[PDB]
Amino acid sequence: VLRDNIQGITKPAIRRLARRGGVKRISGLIYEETRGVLKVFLENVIRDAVTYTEHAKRKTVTAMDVVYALKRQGRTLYGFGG
């Protein structure tokens, strides 16, 4: 069983993204707030990802599955599996 992993996304790893995004100064509350968003985005993709995995009765979530769950929501992905 796993617990308290969301705080594993290190506070710098939030800015290291945000740099690539193109922001200069980051307030104090963003860090605790962004995890709240990313967690919402996974419970969407992962779920849709799991459902296919359950469907074909295969235990392991195939890399090809995640490309589908993304393709349904609207964020297509290129290069992984195909």
């Binding site: 459902t51 589908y68 349904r72």
Partner: protein, 89 residues
């Protein structure tokens, strides 16, 4: 023309309320869209899994992707009743 079918439902859920000739159009245009989304997703879902034929299990899994939250619970609770009732006779 799903309109006769829609009226039969409305007259069940509300024995007194009526429906305007434009709402039917909304619903006849609505049911067709949901049916297309589901049956369209069902076709793509069988293709990923190399299965040739759409079956009872394909539609159920096709629902839980589209309908959000509580609807997914009761719809698939409704669907399983129909198949079991149909398969009963």
């Amino acid at each position: 023309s799903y309109a006769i079918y829609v009226y039969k439902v409305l007259k069940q859920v509300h024995p007194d309320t009526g429906i305007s000739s434009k709402a039917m159009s909304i619903m006849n245009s609505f049911v067709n869209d949901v049916f297309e989304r589901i049956a369209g997703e069902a076709s793509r879902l069988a293709h990923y899994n190399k299965r040739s034929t759409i079956t009872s299990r394909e539609i159920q899994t096709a629902v839980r992707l589209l309908l959000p939250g509580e609807l997914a619970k009761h719809a698939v609770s409704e669907g399983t009743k129909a198949v079991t009732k149909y398969t009963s006779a």
